[PDB]
Structure 1
């Protein structure tokens, strides 16, 4: 079929509202809480993360409130390709 990072293991999905900066990414997840993410040492070179962008993140189990870690960003090729299959519906990005 295809190779995409689905929710496999303990991943999350991350769509930020506004970046406070300095690494911390502020995401409006549908988990319920306001979450704040940080970046590992491999992806601060080739890519670009902005508000209006959907990515997959990975949390740590602490406090289930403010978690997340960037492990993969989504391209203009797959962001809306993950729509018809309904793995995410876009009613949680503007309303």
Structure 2
């Protein structure tokens, strides 16, 4: 039984666009905005996140359109599941 976490609340799917260094990445989000996102230390010490990865972004409560935290990074098999379920589109992944 495959199970895949989903964005909740005001969280958004995003594709990592650029590594900015020191736990920061620009992420192209499913609402069509690029957000500058922090990777929390807890996540940094668990996973390797790279350009092109699909992630869940939590927008910050202030400047919500410009900033967020990355809270999850999907594996490739999870990405394929999300595609099949229509949660994201191939056009979105490629950009």
Structure with the bigger percentage of strand: 2
Gaps of 5+ in 1: none
Give the number of equivalent residue pairs.
95
The two structures have a TM-score, normalised by structure 1, of 0.83
Q: Deviations over 1:12-48 (max 9, x none)?
A: 1121211121222101113232211112231121210
**Contact 1:23/1:38 (8 A) holds in 2:** yes
Q: Which runs of 4+ in 1 moved over 3 A?
A: none
Name which of structure 1's ranges 23-32 and 82-91 shifts more when overlaid on structure 2: 23-32
- Please give the root-mean-square deviation of Cα atoms over the aligned residues, in Å: 1.8
Q: Deviations over 1:37-95 (max 9, x none)?
A: 11223112121000111111211222232122121111122111111110111112324
Name which of structure 1's ranges 27-36 and 50-59 shifts more when overlaid on structure 2: 27-36
**Contact 2:23/2:44 (8 A) holds in 1:** no
Structure with the bigger percentage of helix: 2
